[PDB]
Amino acid sequence: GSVQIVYKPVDLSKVTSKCGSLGNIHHKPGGGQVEVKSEKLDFKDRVQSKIGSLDNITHVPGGGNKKIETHKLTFRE
Amino acid sequence: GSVQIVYKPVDLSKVTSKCGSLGNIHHKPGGGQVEVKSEKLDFKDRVQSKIGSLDNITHVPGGGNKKIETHKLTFRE
Amino acid sequence: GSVQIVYKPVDLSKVTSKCGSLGNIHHKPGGGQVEVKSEKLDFKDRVQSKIGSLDNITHVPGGGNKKIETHKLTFRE
Amino acid sequence: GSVQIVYKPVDLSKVTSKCGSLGNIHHKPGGGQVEVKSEKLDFKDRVQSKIGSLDNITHVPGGGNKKIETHKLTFRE
Amino acid sequence: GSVQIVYKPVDLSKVTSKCGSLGNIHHKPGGGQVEVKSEKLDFKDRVQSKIGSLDNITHVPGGGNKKIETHKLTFRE
Amino acid sequence: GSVQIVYKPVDLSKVTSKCGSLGNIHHKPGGGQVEVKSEKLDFKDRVQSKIGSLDNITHVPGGGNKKIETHKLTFRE
Amino acid sequence: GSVQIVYKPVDLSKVTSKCGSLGNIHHKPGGGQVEVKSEKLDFKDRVQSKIGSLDNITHVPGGGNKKIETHKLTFRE
Amino acid sequence: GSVQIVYKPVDLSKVTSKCGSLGNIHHKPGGGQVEVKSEKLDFKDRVQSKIGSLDNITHVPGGGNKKIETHKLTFRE
Amino acid sequence: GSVQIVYKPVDLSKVTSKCGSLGNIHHKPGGGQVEVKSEKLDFKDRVQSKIGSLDNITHVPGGGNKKIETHKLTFRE
Amino acid sequence: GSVQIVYKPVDLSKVTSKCGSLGNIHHKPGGGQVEVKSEKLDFKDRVQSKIGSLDNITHVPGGGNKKIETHKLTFRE
């Protein structure tokens, strides 16, 4: 028996934005205190650990539009 | 027996936004105190741990529209 | 016996927004105190743990429209 | 039996943005204090650890639009 | 049995941005204090560790649009 | 007329204390938030004002015995 | 008329203390937030003002015994 | 008329203390945030002002006994 | 008329202390943030102002006994 | 009329201390952030101002006993 598979998705999407003016932003963190304690650490896989951090991030993108698209075709016999 | 499969999705979506003016934003964190205690840590898989953190984030995207689209076709025999 | 499957979804959706002016935002956290205690931690799978955190987030997107769309076609024999 | 597979996805998407003016941004972190303690650390896989950090990031991209697209075709016999 | 596979994806996407003026940015970190303690460190794989850091980053790209696209075709017998 | 005044107070008081062991004391304040608003402030005398404060005090004296003694003799004619 | 005044106070007081062991004291303040607002401030005398403070004090004197003694003799005619 | 005044106070006081061991003291302040606003400040006298402070003090005197003694004799005619 | 004044105070006080061992003291301040604003400042007298400070003091005197003694004799005619 | 004044105070006070061992002291300040703003500053007297400071002091005197003694004799006619 013959098997025919056609996979023709179509996309014409648009992701736009507009901003006349963007600014005057203040970010003033006032310190902190962090203390961690451990003995053994065994990470053996796709691990993404993060231990004992004091971080400040200022992320101001003028655009910032994100589009994610995944296609998957699995054929088995 | 013959098997025919046609996969033709169509998209014309739009995700837009507008903002005349965007600003005058203040973010003032007043410190803090964090303490953690542990002995053994075994992470063996797709682990995304995060231990003992004091973080401040200011995220001001002028746009910020997000679109996610996944297609999956699994064929078995 | 022949099997025919046609998969032709259609989308023309729109997700829009408008904002004449957006601003004058204040975020002032007054500190805090966090303490955690543990002995053993075994995470072996798609784990997304988060232990002992003191976080402040200011998220002010001018747009911020989110669209999620998933298609799945499973064929078995 | 003959097997025919056609994989012809089409994309015409656009991800745009506009910003008349973008600036006047202040980021003033006020110090901090971090202390970590450990004995054994065994990482044997695709590990992405990060231990004991005090970081400040100012990320102001004029654009900042991100597009991710993955295609996968697995054939088995 | 003959097997025919055609893989002809097409892309015409565009990722653009515009910014009339971009500047007047201040980033003034106020010091800090970090202390770490360890005994044994065994990393034998694709490890990306980072221990005991005090970092400041100012990333202001005029553009900053990122596009990622991966194609994979696995054939088995 | 002759006036004779004799002022011979006598003190032999003792103020003692004993403590075999004194310790293991924890004081962990969890932040706070204070806001004050005023226009005019006129202090012209022995004034001891204190406005808008967030204070923490740990006072652990091993002794701490206090003795106050005042003598006053006023003669008028 | 003759006036005779004798002022012979006597003190033999003692203020003592004892402490076998004194320690193991923890003082961990968790930040805070203070904001004050004013226009005019006129202090013309023995003024001891204190405005807008965030203070932490750890006072652990091994002794700490205080003795205050004042003598005053006023003669008028 | 003759006036005779004798002023012979006597003191033999003692202020002592003892401490076998004194230590193991921790003082860990977790940051903070202070903001003050003013226009006019007129201080013309024995003024001891203190405006907008974030202070930490660790005062551990092994002794710390304080003695204050004032004598005053005012004669008028 | 003859006036005779005798001023013969006597002091034999002692202020002592003892400490077998004194140490193991930790003082770890976690940063902070201070901001002050003013226009006019007129100080014309014995003024002791202090504006906009972020201070840390560790005062560990092995002794630290303080004695204050003032004598005053005012004669008028 | 004859006036006779005798001023013969006597002091034999002692201010002592003892410390068998004194040490192991840690002082680790974690940065900070200070900002001041002013226009006019007129100081015309015994002024002791101090504006906009970030200071750390470690004062560990082995002795540290302080004695203050003032004598004043004012004669008027």
From Swiss-Prot, chains A, B, C, D, E, F, G, H, I, J:
Tau/MAP repeats lie at residues 3-33, 34-65. It is linked to In Alzheimer disease, the neuronal cytoskeleton in the brain is progressively disrupted and replaced by tangles of paired helical filaments (PHF) and straight filaments, mainly composed of hyperphosphorylated forms of TAU (PHF-TAU or AD P-TAU). O-GlcNAcylation is greatly reduced in Alzheimer disease brain cerebral cortex leading to an increase in TAU/MAPT phosphorylations. Frontotemporal dementia 1: A form of dementia characterized by pathologic finding of frontotemporal lobar degeneration, presenile dementia with behavioral changes, deterioration of cognitive capacities and loss of memory. In some cases, parkinsonian symptoms are prominent. Neuropathological changes include frontotemporal atrophy often associated with atrophy of the basal ganglia, substantia nigra, amygdala. In most cases, protein tau deposits are found in glial cells and/or neurons. Interacts with MARK1, MARK2, MARK3 and MARK4. Interacts with PSMC2 through SQSTM1. Interacts with SQSTM1 when polyubiquitinated. Interacts with FKBP4. Binds to CSNK1D. Interacts with SGK1. Interacts with PIN1. Interacts with LRRK2. Interacts with LRP1, leading to endocytosis; this interaction is reduced in the presence of LRPAP1/RAP. The modification N6,N6-dimethyllysine is found at K8. The modification Phosphoserine is found at S2, S21, S49, S53. The chain holds residues 621 to 697 of 758 of the full protein. It comes from the Eukaryota. The tau/MAP repeat binds to tubulin. Type I isoforms contain 3 repeats while type II isoforms contain 4 repeats. Changing S2N: In FTD1; minimal parkinsonism; very early age of onset. There is a cross-link at K8, K14, K18, K28, K40, K44, K50, K66, K72 (Glycyl lysine isopeptide (Lys-Gly) (interchain with G-Cter in ubiquitin)). Glycans are attached at K44, K50, K66. This is Microtubule-associated protein tau. Promotes microtubule assembly and stability, and might be involved in the establishment and maintenance of neuronal polarity. The C-terminus binds axonal microtubules while the N-terminus binds neural plasma membrane components, suggesting that tau functions as a linker protein between both. Axonal polarity is predetermined by TAU/MAPT localization (in the neuronal cell) in the domain of the cell body defined by the centrosome. The short isoforms allow plasticity of the cytoskeleton whereas the longer isoforms may preferentially play a role in its stabilization. Expressed in neurons. Isoform PNS-tau is expressed in the peripheral nervous system while the others are expressed in the central nervous system.
